[PDB]
Structure 1
Amino acid sequence: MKVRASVKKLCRNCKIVKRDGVIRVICSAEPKHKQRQG
Structure 2
Amino acid sequence: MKVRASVKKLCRNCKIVKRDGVIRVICSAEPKHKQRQG
TM-score tier (shorter): 0.5 to 0.7
Identity of aligned residues (%): 100
* TM-score between the two structures when normalised by the length of structure 2: 0.67
The superposition leaves residues 1-38 of structure 1 with CA deviations (integer Å, 9 ceiling, x where unpaired) of: 21211111112201111011111112122122221016
Which has the larger helix fraction? 1
For structure 2, the 5+ residue unaligned runs are none
SS in 1 for 2:19: coil
* Count of matched residue positions in the alignment of Structure 1 and Structure 2: 38
Return the structure number with greater strand share.
2
TM-score normalised per structure 1: 0.67
